[PDB]
Design a protein around this nucleic acid. Structure first.
Ligand code: NA
Ligand code: NA
Ligand SMILES: [Zn+2]
Length: 327
DNA sequence: CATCTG
DNA sequence: CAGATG
């Protein structure tokens, strides 16, 4: 957790690069486990040979760990941190809609910066275009004080459209966080479930309402169950307009809400622990459900949930206020 | 994993 | 349809 921090960090830089700049997914996976294993390792890696001893750790990485241990830096890491091509890609990538793939194409075309992009708006697609247009807003965290205003609006409109709607704002906003990255809304309706054959209007209606009142500003992607978009709290009395925020809305069959709502609320760690305890308590838990575990190895069959309460009980645990769902 | 692009 | 991105 700190006894091998550098090692792990360097490794992570290395991995990332293989993957983003080069195409080196193997290499890239290579850096990854190594860090993971070294990450657990209980001692102070005093040498490469010592690390090598570990699995995941081979010859080349040992080499690297040596040079790093020996001199506060790495040549390769050095050479990578400079290189404009490499940094270009790490940069373009910040735009919402550019993955490495695209970052590489663009750079080869010579777009390596914000303006470059602007000049080449033709070459960008709708998601990318929006990303570019709100590059700044997009990097801005979301203060909970804004989040509350947000949630306030969303929930009121969802209600007006259909009393039977059930909306929840997951994320850390939920676990109490002071600020957040984007707004995740979990959505469901009684008339929609596991078997019930679809209902696209179910989602399309609200999205529509939201736009109606101008809360939603643009659409990133709009499917029958998942909607990726942009919203914005109406600027009060002109002088201060808000940033544009990322927002997601997703339809869930009522029969697996709370597992979702559970899950999406995190944190990753709380999940894992809850996950592991359920397994003890003779169960299985996933994004959508909780099933009893047969001894034959495994075994199915969806238990029935009506609240995040039904779930805990099952695995026989203390209800966890979201605030304390941390780890 | 769901959506888009081309 | 494969392949990209979130
Ligand atoms: Na990106
Ligand atoms: Na292939
Ligand atoms: Zn030791």
């Amino acid at each position: 957790e700190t006894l091998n921090g550098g090692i792990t960090d360097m490794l992570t830089e290395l991995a990332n690069f293989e993957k983003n700049v080069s195409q080196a997914i193997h290499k890239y996976n290579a850096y990854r486990k190594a860090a993971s294993v070294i990450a657990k390792y209980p001692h102070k890696i005093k040498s490469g040979a010592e690390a090598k001893k570990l699995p995941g750790v081979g010859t080349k990485i040992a080499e690297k760990i040596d040079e790093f241990l020996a001199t506060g830096k790495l040549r390769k890491l050095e050479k990578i941190r400079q290189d404009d091509t490499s940094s270009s890609i790490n940069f373009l990538t910040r735009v919402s809609g550019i993955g490495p793939s695209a970052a590489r194409k663009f750079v080869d075309e010579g777009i390596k910066t914000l303006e470059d992009l602007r000049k080449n708006e033709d070459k960008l697609n709708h998601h990318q275009r929006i990303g570019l247009k709100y590059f700044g807003d997009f990097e801005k965290r979301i203060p909970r004080e804004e989040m509350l205003q947000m949630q306030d609006i969303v929930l009121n409109e969802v209600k007006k459209v259909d009393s039977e709607y059930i909306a929840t704002v997951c994320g850390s906003f939920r676990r109490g966080a002071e600020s957040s990255g984007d707004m995740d809304v979990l959505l469901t309706h009684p008339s929609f479930t596991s078997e019930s054959t679809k209902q696209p209007k179910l989602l399309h209606q609200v999205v529509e309402q939201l736009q109606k009142v101008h809360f939603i500003t643009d659409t990133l992607s709009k499917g029958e169950t998942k909607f990726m978009g942009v919203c914005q709290l109406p600027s009060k009395n002109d002088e201060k307009e808000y940033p544009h925020r990322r927002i997601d809305i997703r339809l869930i069959p009522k029969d697996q809400y709370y597992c979702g709502v559970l899950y999406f609320t995190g944190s990753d760690i709380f999940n894992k622990n809850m996950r592991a305890h359920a397994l003890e308590k003779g169960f299985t838990i996933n994004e959508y459900t909780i099933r009893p575990l047969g001894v034959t190895g495994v075994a199915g069959e969806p238990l029935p949930v009506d609240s995040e309460k039904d779930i805990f009980d099952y695995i026989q645990w203390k209800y966890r206020e979201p605030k304390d769902r941390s780890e």
